[PDB]
């Protein structure tokens, strides 16, 4: 019953040139920017990815980011969000995703990235996020997403990895962080992505999970991350990408979702917000654009629902998981 009402002067056209400018300029002090240093690597992945999807990557600084990435690889092989920060699977994925957009994977020590990821797997097949032992199926995704882009999936115990993720499958067809955790969109995305990469989508109850996911669509057309929550562009990306992976994208109203996402654009400043009239950010701009791409927008490059990167990058490196259709 909770939902947003879209105001009737909301944006209803794709402001691509504005989003390009917003991202082209982002990180030129600034409050949220300096406060978001602990996630810089992923911010950089969000900006570069969305630019590349709009055909605008060349406007970003390749050389500069390549140097930055290299100085974020630690001696254990893991990559940190920023220089001086600690290595983590999240930023290891983001870095490997950036180097893949740039075809510069050997800017880092790939053998040591692999060894780092491999080191984080536990006896039950789960992955910790870093040396401090937090277990989350997000990290199961980060590990195999990373190893797949590197061609090193065989470096981990895949069957145990699979067993752990399926053990996080719930009554509703969804997935949680850890065994017994409740389903939600972000977690479902990670686990369905994981199962795409490991060739296990046959073990998903697509009809049951598909239904839970399409029930995320609210009358406004936006998708929420779980029952009794507000719709959101990020939740919308996760849910729709999950639906595509399991072959049920047609189970939501695509035109109503398109309108929700377009309405989250800022006509003045460019970029997308989490919901209409909120303040934009680069995170929701990637997901807005990626979502619209998945919904069939011909101006945006096709995006992988698994890696949230342009399909053409993935085709080039030859990593393209079979989906459910």
């Amino acid at each position: 019953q909770k939902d947003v009402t879209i105001k009737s002067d909301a944006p209803d056209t794709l402001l691509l040139e504005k989003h390009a400018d917003y991202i082209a300029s982002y990180g030129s002090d600034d409050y949220e920017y300096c406060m978001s240093e602990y996630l810089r690597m992923s911010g950089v992945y969000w900006g570069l990815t969305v630019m590349d999807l709009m055909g605008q990557l060349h406007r970003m600084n390749k050389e500069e980011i390549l140097v930055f990435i290299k100085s974020c690889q630690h001696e254990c092989g893991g990559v940190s969000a920023s220089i001086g920060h600690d290595p983590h699977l999240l930023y290891t994925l983001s870095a490997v995703q950036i180097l893949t957009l740039y075809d510069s994977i050997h800017v880092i020590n790939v053998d040591k990235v692999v060894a780092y990821v491999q080191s984080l797997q536990k006896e039950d097949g789960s992955f910790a996020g870093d040396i401090w032992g937090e277990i989350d199926t997000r990290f199961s995704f980060c590990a195999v997403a990373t190893l797949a882009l590197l061609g090193k999936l065989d470096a981990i115990n895949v069957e145990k990895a699979i067993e752990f993720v399926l053990s996080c499958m719930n009554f509703d067809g969804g997935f949680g962080c850890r065994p017994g955790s409740e389903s939600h969109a972000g977690q479902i995305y990670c686990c369905t992505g994981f199962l795409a990469i490991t060739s296990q989508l046959h073990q998903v109850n697509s009809d049951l999970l598909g239904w839970w996911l399409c029930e995320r669509q609210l009358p406004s057309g936006g998708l929420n991350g779980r029952p009794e929550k507000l719709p959101d562009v990020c939740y919308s990306w996760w849910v729709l990408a999950s639906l595509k992976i399991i072959g049920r994208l047609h189970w939501i109203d695509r035109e109503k979702l398109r309108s929700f996402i377009l309405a989250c654009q800022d006509e003045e400043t460019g970029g997308f917000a989490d919901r209409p009239g909120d303040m934009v950010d680069p995170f929701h701009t990637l997901f807005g654009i990626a979502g619209l791409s998945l919904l069939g927008e011909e101006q945006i490059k096709p995006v992988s629902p698994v890696f949230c990167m342009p399909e053409e990058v993935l085709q080039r490196v030859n990593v393209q998981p079979e989906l459910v259709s």
Binding site: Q1, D29, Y31, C34, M35, E37, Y38, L39, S80, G84, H85, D86, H88, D130, W132, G133, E134, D136, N170, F171, D172, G176, C177, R178, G180, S181, E182, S183, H184, D207, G210, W211, W212, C214, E215, Q217, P219, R226, P227, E228, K229, D232, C234, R248, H250, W251, I252, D253, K256, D266, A273, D274, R275, G277, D278, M279, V280, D281, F283, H284
Partner: protein
């Protein structure tokens, strides 16, 4: 993480600049200290300021753990217990402010995991308090399962906590979910026992007649409907209960004709009873449901096609 705010504005922009410099200098110093191998209480001080406002700054949680670990080697068990109790207080003040941070909840689990005498009843009480504030806080429900495990708390006690949570308010998805994992543990086969299932059906049916717009009970009810015997395996009791559920949903549908949940459940109940005998009504129900819930028309057509197919297989099975 954070998202989002709506889109004298200089004393707001002034204070933001002021907080940044404190954040910036503090951050600077912690890192300088850390690079200098200075693993002392000054780092606990510096980080307490930053982590209170940014508990997602993971590296600072890591710094705290390094300080705490180092100090534990070079401190009496009396000084170590004091640093620990201060850390529990700090964690709680952080959670009161942002109860949905992975970092803070993980630090607490890390902390409690390495204590010699952990007070788990106190931790379960912490969960009860946070779940009163937000009964959908999955971080807290997860911490609660962690604690429950550590304290070897019995599934029946957690099942009683879920019942108290359901009757007393809505926002029950988290509670039904917990029940779905708890019940199979109580009846642990390598498909719940009928007696239990029938009791759960009673409890869920109460919920969705109490509040017909409560989607959580309808979602749980659908799982219960699958988690049982089979239609030519129906006891007279199950048969009778499901029939009684069908009439009750139709009664609901009289009252709430725009309620899509009760319509979908009527179809699923008919499937559960007799796919072929109820074939005409099922098809009638699809047309109505699709008019009530058009965003789902594609889903509903695919479900209907699945069912039509199953009905073809059942008719072919005819001797």
């Amino acid at each position: 993480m954070h998202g989002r705010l709506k889109v004298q504005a200089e004393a707001k922009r002034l204070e933001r600049e002021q907080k940044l410099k404190l954040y910036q200098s503090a951050t600077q110093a912690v890192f300088q200290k850390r690079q200098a191998g200075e693993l002392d209480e000054s780092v606990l001080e510096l980080t307490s300021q930053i982590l209170g406002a940014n508990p997602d700054f993971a590296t600072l949680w890591n710094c705290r753990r390094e300080v705490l670990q180092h100090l534990e080697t070079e401190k009496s068990p009396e000084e170590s217990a004091a640093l620990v109790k201060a850390e529990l207080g700090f964690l709680e003040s952080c959670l009161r402010v942002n109860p949905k941070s992975y970092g803070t909840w993980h630090h607490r689990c890390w902390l409690l995991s390495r204590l010699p005498e952990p007070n788990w009843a106190r931790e379960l009480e912490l969960c009860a308090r946070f779940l009163e504030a937000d009964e959908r806080n999955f971080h807290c429900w997860d911490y609660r399962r962690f604690v429950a495990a550590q304290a070897a708390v019995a599934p029946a006690e957690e099942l009683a906590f879920t019942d108290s949570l359901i009757t007393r308010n809505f926002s029950n998805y988290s509670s039904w979910h917990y029940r779905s994992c708890l019940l199979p543990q109580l009846h642990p086969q390598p498909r719940l026992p009928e007696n239990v299932l029938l009791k759960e059906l009673e409890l869920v049916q109460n919920a969705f007649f109490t509040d017909p717009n409560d989607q959580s009970a309808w979602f749980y009810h659908r799982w219960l409907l699958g988690a049982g015997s089979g239609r030519c395996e129906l006891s007279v009791e199950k048969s009778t209960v499901l029939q009684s559920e069908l009439e009750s949903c139709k009664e609901l549908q009289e009252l709430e004709p725009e309620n899509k949940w009760c319509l979908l459940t009527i179809i699923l109940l008919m499937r559960a009873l007799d796919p072929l005998l109820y074939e005409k009504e099922t098809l009638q129900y699809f047309s109505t449901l699709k008019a009530v819930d058009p965003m789902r028309a594609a889903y509903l057509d695919d479900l209907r096609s699945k069912f039509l197919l199953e009905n073809s297989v059942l008719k072919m099975e005819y001797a």
